[PDB]
């Protein structure tokens, strides 16, 4: 299938409690593979998946150096953004940044991303053209003029079309036995009576990877979107994910309800009903 690499940066100030913390994590699809935390005793980019451990010291030293520089630049950036919003020195604030690339099954760049938020709201984002910006407000317009003057879009575009695509392809090959393996969900339907009039049908999906999945309930072949309760997909702890969908049905109408499961590990889509 198609694949993605993303780096997630969080920089968090904490006035009176030391300098702002900088954390970076790298993902391929739903697999984390590196982390950096400026609060660590020896801050370094560290492995978090086995297929990255083979990279050499030149790799780890470049990734560590860039992250230590990033620690300082994001500290400066939190001061700058506090000024841009006329904010007190006593408050805690957060810059977030996610960037990376999507490639198709042939490894060709589908698109690149670079987006930033401040205290949880969109701040500035590189446009899909990898050459223009979208500033959310007049404070972010300052960053944009700073970034146009430093031709930042060109440096990000070069990364997104170059290293990002190239290293993602390398990781996918080095970790092909996991990153390129889709595990289908294990499924089952449970029945839990609510009253004498109704019962809950819950359609379970367990042990699947990647996280992308479609679980839906149908009544007489019609989707029950507005009446279906879907939990947020959740991690099991072993790389796989879990999800369930629930629908409340009249007692005795259970057979009119079917659960439909779509996942890329599945040879064919699944249709499930309660087997009493």
């Amino acid at each position: 299938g198609s694949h993605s690499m993303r780096y997630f940066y969080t920089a968090m100030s904490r006035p009176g409690r030391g300098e702002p913390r900088f954390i970076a994590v790298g993902y391929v699809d739903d697999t984390q593979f590196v982390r950096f935390d400026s609060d660590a005793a020896s801050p370094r980019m560290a492995p978090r998946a086995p297929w990255i451990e083979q990279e050499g010291p030149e790799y780890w030293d470049r990734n560590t150096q860039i992250s230590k520089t990033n620690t300082q630049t994001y500290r400066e950036s939190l001061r700058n953004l506090r000024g841009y919003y006329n904010q007190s020195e006593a408050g805690s604030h957060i810059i977030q940044r996610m960037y990376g690339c999507d490639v198709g099954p042939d490894g060709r760049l589908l698109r690149g991303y670079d987006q930033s938020a401040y205290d949880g709201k969109d701040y500035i984002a590189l446009n899909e053209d990898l050459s223009s910006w979208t500033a959310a407000d007049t404070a972010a317009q300052i960053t944009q003029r700073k970034w146009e003057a430093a031709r930042e879009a060109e440096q990000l575009r070069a990364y997104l079309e170059g290293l990002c695509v190239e290293w993602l392809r390398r990781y996918l090959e080095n970790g092909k036995e996991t990153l390129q393996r889709a595990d289908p969900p294990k499924t089952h339907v449970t029945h839990h009576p609510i009253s004498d009039h109704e019962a809950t049908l819950r359609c379970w999906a367990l042990g699947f990877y990647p996280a992308e999945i479609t679980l839906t309930w149908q009544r007489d072949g019609e989707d029950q979107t507005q009446d279906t309760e879907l939990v947020e997909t959740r991690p099991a702890g072993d790389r796989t994910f879990q999800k369930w969908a629930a629908v409340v049905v009249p007692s005795g109408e259970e057979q009119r309800y079917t659960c439909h499961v779509q996942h890329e590990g599945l040879p064919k889509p699944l249709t499930l009903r309660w087997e009493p």
Binding site: Y7, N63, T73, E76, S77, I95, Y99, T143, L156, W167
Partner: peptide
């Protein structure tokens, strides 16, 4: 691999 450290905001 990470992107080169960029410009402050």
């Amino acid at each position: 691999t990470v992107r080169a450290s960029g410009h402050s905001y």
